[PDB]
Design a protein around this ligand. Structure first.
Ligand SMILES: C[C@@H]1CC[C@@]2(OC1)O[C@H]1C[C@H]3[C@@H]4CC=C5C[C@@H](OCCC(CO[C@H]6O[C@H](CO)[C@@H](O[C@H]7O[C@H](CO)[C@@H](O)[C@H](O)[C@H]7O)[C@H](O)[C@H]6O)CO[C@H]6O[C@H](CO)[C@@H](O[C@H]7O[C@H](CO)[C@@H](O)[C@H](O)[C@H]7O)[C@H](O)[C@H]6O)CC[C@]5(C)[C@H]4CC[C@]3(C)[C@H]1[C@@H]2C
Ligand SMILES: CCCCCCCCCCCCCCCCCCCCCCCCCC(=O)N[C@@H](CO)[C@H](O)[C@H](O)CCCCCCCCCCCCCC
Lengths: 183, 99, 67, 554
C-alpha cells in the first residue's frame, strides 16, 4: 500500500490485556510546551478540605429524611462519593480544553496528576481519605456482614484498586462488554 | 552545469534529515548568478526591469528549481509591452549565445 | 478647565440625598432586606443559570430550610 | 439585525481636542522616575483572601460542571432534530465535536455580552459605544442606532498617541499624498523605499543596537523568527507564562522545550545544570546550543523580570538570551528606552531584542534588533522578507513621527510630560486602590493594575454595574487565568486626568461596598495593619504621599 510521508495514526488494542505505548519525541515536546490545567488545581490552596466538606454535607442531607436508616444513609453517601470519584478520575479520558493536536487524548486525570509522578502527597491524601471513611462508617454503627461484604468490595474495587501502581498505564478490553481502547 | 533536479532534491532532503548546520550547493549558486546576469544585462542596455523568482532553498520541502518571471498590469499600453518583449528576447538571445 | 461632551452620571448617595428619599423610620428595614437579599444572591450561582434551574434551586433551598 | 454605520459628529475643534487629549491641571501632578543602579530586586509578595471564598468558588464550579453535562447528555440523547450541527448528515463528520466546545457553549455563552462590544471613532480618553439589545440568551442582538460616550480603561494607548489632530496625523496625510497606499510586493524584489531604510536606522539608533529589521506584523514576526536558526538538536528554555506567538514559533522550529516556574531562579539554574549534564535524549550526546526566552513585562501579572540574574547566568554557563518587550519599550524607563534602562544593564549583553509599535506608538508592526554580523545572516535566512507583503507608508510615517517626538527632536518638551503624567497616574491609582482595601498586583510602576475578583458570578455583575456608570472595563477568567483567581485588568493612559481618577475611585468604592469585593490583610500595608480608609480622606491625602518610594510594599 501507499505509505504516508508523515504518519500520525491512532492504533487500538488487540488483546484482552494491554498497555499503552510510551510517547514519542514530538508528543513529549507538545506536552511539555504548555502546562496542563486539569491536573494543576488539585495541589492549589483550599483543594483538600473541600472533600471533607462535601462528605459532611452528604452525611447531613442523607440523614435529613426521616425514613432513612443510619446504615442505609452511610451506604448511600458511600455510593455518592465513590461513584462521583470514579466518574471524575477514571472514567473520562481527555481534556475539555483544546491542546496542541490530540495531546492528552489517551490518559485519565489520575494519570495526569503531577506529571505522572508517583508517591506524591496529593495521591497519598486521595488514597487515604476513602479508607478513613470506610473505617469510620464501619465503626460508627451496628452492621451485618450481608451488605458489609458488598460495601467493602465496592470500596476496594472502585476506590482502592485503580490507585495501585500495578494498574497504572493499564487498559482492559473485553471483546464485547467493553469497547476497544486506543494504545 | 552538469546536474539534474532529482539529484538536487535528494541532496537537500539528505542534508535536512542529517541536520547539518552548513547547507551550501554550488551549481544552484551558479544558476542563480547566471539568471541575475541576464537580469542585469537587460537592465543596463535597455530601460526595462524584470526580476527572478526569489526563494529560500533551505526551507523548502518539495522539488523546485530556479526560474524567471515577468509581470504586467492594466495601466500599460500594447506598443510599450511589445517593445519590452522584443528587448528582453534580444537580451536573452545575446546572453545565452557564445557557447 | 475646558468643557467636553461627557455626561456625568451622579452617584447613588448624591441622588438619594438630593431626592429626600432617606427616611429614618422606614428605610433601615429596607436596607437590611437589601443586604440580606444581595449577600444571599451574589455568593452563590444564580446569575449564570437558567430560569427553570434557578427556580428549582430556589425551591430546593426553601425546602431545605423549611425542613 | 445588522451593525449600523454611524454618521460622524460635527463639533468645534476645542471640544474634540478635549475629548481626545486632556489638558493638565497643576504642575504638581507629575512624577519623574529614578534609575535603580543595579540594586537587587526583592522577591514579590502576594496577599490571600479567607477560606470560605475559595470554598464557595469550588462549590460554584462543581455545580456548573455537573449541570452542564446533565443538559448536554439529555439534549443530545432526546432532542436530536434541534441539534443538527453536532451530528453527521451524510457520511460527513461535523466541523467540530461537542466535547472540545463544552467550555464555550456551557459557561462562556451566558457571558458573551461582556466580551465583544462594537465602538466607533478614535479611542481616546472618552470612547463612543454602540447600543445593543440582547435576545434569547446572547444568541443574536438588535441595534437601535444610538451612541453614548464612556470612559475607557481598556485600550492600549499608554502615551496617548491615538489622535486625529496632531503632527503625526499631518505627517501621515502628507505621506498618503506623496506615497500611494499600495505597495509593490515582498521586500526582496520590489517594495523597498527610502522610508524603510530611514525607519530602520532610526529604530536602531533609538534602541541602542547596531542594526535592525522592521516587519508589518508582530505575531507573524514571532511565529516565523525561530525556525531560521534552530533545529531538532537544540534546546529552548522558556518561562511558563509566555505569549502564544512564541509557543507557535517554537512549535514550528521543532526544537526541544523545557519550562521553569515563574520567578524561580534556583530552579532555573538547577535545570540548566541538569540539561547540560544529561545531553540529548536516548543518545546522551551534547546539545548544539541553548537559548533562553523571557518577557520584559507580563501583562496578566504586571511584574518585571530579573534581568541581571539572567545576564549573570548566561555569562557563567555560556548561554544565549532572547527578550520579548512589547509592553515596556515606550512606557517604562527614565527616558523610555525599555527594561535595559531601569536596571542599568548594557544593551550589548542581550542577544536579540524584539518589540511591537502597537501598544505605545499608535501604529501597527514590529521590529528586531541585533548585531551587524547577525542581521546580515538573518536578512538572508528569514522567510518573512522574501515571501510576504511589506509595510505601508502611512504606518511608517506615524511610527517615525512618534519616535522623533519621544526622542525629543521634533518637539522640545512634549514626551517628558507624557512620561511623567503616566507614571504619576499609575502610582496614584495603585496607592488609592490599596488604601481603600482591595487587592492589586504590580511593581508600583507598571501601567497594568489587576484587581482580583474571586467568585465566578461577581465578574458579570461588576462589568454591568460599571457599564451603568458609563465606564468601560475588561474582565478575564478561566482558563486564561488560574481557576480560583479571576481579575479585572485596568490599562492606565496618559490622556486621563486626576479628576477622572477621583470619579472612578468614588464609583468603584460604592460598587465594591455593594458587592463585597474589598478583603485586605496586613501583608499589603507597610505598617502591618489592615486599613479601611474613608473615601474623602483618601482623596485628600493620597496624591501628595504617592511620590515617596516607601509606601509601596513591592
Ligand atoms: C436525580 C437524577 C439521577 C440520575 C441522573 O439525573 C438526575 O443523574 C445525572 C448525572 C448524569 C451523568 C453525569 C456525568 C456524566 C459524564 C459524561 O462524560 C461524557 C464525556 C465523554 C463524551 O460524552 C459526551 O459525548 C459523547 C460523544 O460520543 C456522547 O456519546 C453519544 O451520545 C449520544 C448517544 O448517547 C449520541 O449523540 C452519540 O452516540 C454519542 O455522541 C455522550 O452522550 C456525551 O455525554 C468524553 O469522553 C469521550 O470523548 C470523546 C467523545 O467526544 C470520545 O471519542 C474520542 O475517542 C478518541 C479518544 O480515545 C478520540 O481520539 C476520538 O477523536 C474521539 O472520537 C472518547 O473516546 C471519550 O473519552 C457522560 C454522561 C454522565 C455519565 C452522565 C449520565 C447521565 C446522568 C447519570 C444523569 C441522570 C439522568
Ligand atoms: C435512592 C437513592 C440512590 C442513591 C444512588 C447514588 C447515585 C450517585 C450518583 C452520583 C452523581 C454524581 C456523579 C458525577 C458528578 C460529578 C462528575 C463531574 C465530571 C465532569 C467532567 C469532569 C472534567 C474535569 C475537568 C475540569 O474541569 N476540572 C476542574 C477544573 O479544571 C474542575 O472544574 C474543578 O476542579 C471543580 C471540581 C472540584 C470539585 C470537588 C470535587 C471532588 C469531590 C467529588 C464528589 C462529587 C459529589 C457530587 C455532589
Amino acid at each position: 500500500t501507499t505509505e504516508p510521508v508523515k504518519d500520525h495514526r491512532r492504533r487500538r488494542a488487540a488483546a484482552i490485556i494491554s498497555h499503552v505505548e510510551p510517547e514519542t519525541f514530538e508528543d513529549e515536546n507538545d506536552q511539555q510546551l504548555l502546562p496542563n490545567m486539569n491536573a494543576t488545581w488539585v495541589d492549589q490552596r483550599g483543594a483538600w478540605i473541600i472533600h471533607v466538606v462535601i462528605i459532611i454535607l452528604l452525611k447531613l442531607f442523607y440523614n435529613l429524611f426521616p425514613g432513612v436508616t443510619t446504615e442505609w444513609s452511610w451506604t448511600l453517601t458511600n455510593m455518592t462519593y465513590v461513584i462521583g470519584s470514579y466518574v471524575m478520575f477514571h472514567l473520562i479520558k481527555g481534556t475539555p480544553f483544546d491542546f496542541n493536536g490530540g495531546a492528552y487524548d489517551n490518559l485519565t486525570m489520575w494519570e495526569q496528576i503531577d506529571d505522572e509522578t508517583l508517591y506524591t502527597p496529593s495521591r497519598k491524601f486521595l488514597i487515604s481519605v476513602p479508607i478513613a471513611l470506610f473505617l469510620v462508617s464501619t465503626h460508627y454503627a451496628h452492621y451485618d456482614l450481608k451488605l458489609f461484604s458488598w460495601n467493602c468490595f465496592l470500596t476496594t474495587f472502585g476506590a482502592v484498586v485503580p490507585k495501585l501502581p500495578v494498574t497504572h498505564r493499564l487498559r482492559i478490553s473485553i471483546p464485547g462488554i467493553t469497547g476497544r481502547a486506543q494504545i | 552545469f552538469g546536474y539534474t533536479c532529482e539529484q538536487l532534491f535528494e541532496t537537500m532532503s539528505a542534508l535536512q534529515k542529517k541536520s547539518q548546520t552548513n547547507k551550501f550547493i554550488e551549481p544552484y549558486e551558479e544558476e542563480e548568478k547566471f539568471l541575475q546576469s541576464i537580469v542585469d544585462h537587460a537592465l543596463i542596455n535597455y530601460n526595462v526591469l524584470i526580476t527572478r523568482n526569489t526563494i529560500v532553498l533551505k526551507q523548502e520541502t518539495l522539488p523546485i528549481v530556479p526560474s524567471l518571471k515577468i509581470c504586467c498590469n492594466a495601466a500599460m499600453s500594447p506598443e510599450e509591452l511589445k517593445n519590452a518583449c522584443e528587448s528582453v528576447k534580444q537580451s536573452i538571445l545575446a546572453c545565452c549565445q557564445e557557447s | 478647565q475646558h468643557k467636553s461632551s461627557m455626561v456625568y452620571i451622579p452617584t447613588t448617595k448624591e441622588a438619594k440625598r438630593r431626592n429626600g428619599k432617606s427616611e429614618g423610620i422606614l428605610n433601615t428595614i429596607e436596607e437590611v432586606v437589601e443586604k440580606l437579599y444581595w449577600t444571599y444572591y451574589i455568593h452563590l450561582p444564580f446569575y449564570l443559570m437558567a430560569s427553570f434551574d434557578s427556580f428549582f434551586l430556589h425551591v430546593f433551598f426553601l425546602t431545605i430550610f423549611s425542613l | 439585525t445588522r451593525v449600523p454605520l454611524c454618521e460622524p459628529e460635527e463639533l468645534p475643534d476645542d471640544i474634540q481636542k478635549e475629548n481626545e487629549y486632556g489638558t493638565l491641571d497643576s504642575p504638581g501632578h507629575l512624577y519623574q522616575v529614578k534609575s535603580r543602579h543595579g540594586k537587587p530586586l526583592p522577591e514579590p509578595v502576594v496577599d490571600t483572601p479567607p477560606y470560605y471564598i475559595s470554598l464557595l468558588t469550588y462549590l460554584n464550579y462543581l455545580i456548573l460542571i455537573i449541570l452542564g453535562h446533565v443538559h448536554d447528555f439529555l439534549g443530545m440523547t432526546f432532542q436530536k432534530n434541534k441539534h443538527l450541527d453536532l451530528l453527521e448528515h451524510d457520511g460527513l463528520a461535523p466541523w467540530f465535536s461537542n466535547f472540545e466546545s463544552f467550555y464555550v457553549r456551557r459557561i462562556k455563552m451566558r457571558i458573551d455580552d461582556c466580551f465583544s462590544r462594537p465602538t466607533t471613532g478614535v479611542p481616546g480618553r472618552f470612547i463612543r459605544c454602540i447600543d445593543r439589545i440582547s435576545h434569547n440568551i446572547n444568541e443574536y442582538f438588535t441595534y437601535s442606532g444610538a451612541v453614548y460616550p464612556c470612559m475607557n480603561l481598556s485600550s492600549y494607548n499608554y502615551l496617548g498617541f491615538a489622535q486625529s489632530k496632531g503632527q503625526c496625523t499631518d505627517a501621515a496625510l502628507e505621506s498618503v499624498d506623496k506615497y500611494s497606499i499600495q505597495s509593490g510586493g515582498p521586500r526582496a524584489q520590489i517594495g523597498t523605499t527610502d522610508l524603510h531604510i530611514k525607519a530602520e536606522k532610526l529604530v536602531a539608533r533609538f534602541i541602542g543596537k547596531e542594526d535592525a529589521l522592521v516587519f508589518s506584523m508582530g505575531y507573524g514576526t514571532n511565529a516565523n523568527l525561530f525556525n531560521a536558526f534552530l533545529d531538532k538538536k537544540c534546546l529552548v528554555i522558556s518561562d511558563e507564562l509566555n505569549h502564544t506567538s512564541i509557543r507557535t514559533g517554537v512549535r514550528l522550529s521543532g526544537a526541544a522545550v523545557r519550562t521553569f516556574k515563574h520567578g524561580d531562579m534556583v530552579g532555573l539554574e538547577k535545570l540548566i545544570r541538569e540539561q547540560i549534564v544529561l545531553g540529548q535524549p536516548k543518545t546522551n550526546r551534547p546539545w548544539k546550543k541553548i537559548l533562553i526566552c523571557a518577557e520584559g513585562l507580563f501583562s496578566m501579572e504586571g511584574t518585571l523580570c530579573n534581568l541581571p540574574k539572567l545576564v549573570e547566568l548566561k555569562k557563567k554557563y555560556k548561554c544565549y538570551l532572547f527578550i520579548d518587550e512589547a509592553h515596556s519599550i515606550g512606557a517604562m524607563g527614565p527616558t523610555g528606552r525599555g527594561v535595559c534602562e531601569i536596571f542599568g544593564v548594557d544593551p550589548k549583553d542581550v542577544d536579540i531584542l524584539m518589540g511591537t509599535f502597537t501598544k505605545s506608538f499608535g501604529a501597527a508592526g514590529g521590529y528586531i534588533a541585533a548585531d551587524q554580523w547577525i542581521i546580515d545572516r538573518l536578512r538572508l535566512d528569514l522567510t518573512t522578507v522574501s515571501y510576504s507583503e511589506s509595510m505601508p507608508a502611512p504606518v511608517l510615517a506615524q511610527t517615525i513621527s512618534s519616535l522623533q517626538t519621544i526622542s525629543g527632536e521634533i518637539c522640545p518638551g512634549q514626551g517628558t510630560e507624557r512620561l511623567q503624567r503616566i507614571a504619576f497616574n499609575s502610582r496614584y491609582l495603585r496607592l488609592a486602590l490599596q488604601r481603600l482595601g482591595f487587592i492589586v498586583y504590580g511593581v508600583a510602576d507598571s501601567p497594568v493594575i489587576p484587581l482580583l475578583l474571586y467568585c465566578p458570578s461577581k465578574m458579570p455583575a461588576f462589568s454591568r454595574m460599571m457599564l451603568q456608570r458609563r465606564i468601560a472595563v475588561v474582565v478575564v477568567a478561566y482558563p486564561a487565568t488560574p481557576l480560583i483567581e479571576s481579575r479585572v485588568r485596568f490599562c492606565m493612559s496618559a490622556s486621563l486626568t486626576k479628576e477622572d481618577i477621583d470619579y472612578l475611585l468614588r464609583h468603584v468604592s460604592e460598587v465594591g461596598d455593594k458587592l463585597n469585593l474589598k478583603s485586605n490583610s496586613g501583608k499589603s500595608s507597610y505598617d502591618g495593619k489592615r486599613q479601611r480608609w474613608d473615601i474623602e480622606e483618601v482623596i485628600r491625602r493620597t496624591p501628595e504621599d504617592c511620590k515617596d518610594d516607601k509606601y509601596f510594599v513591592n
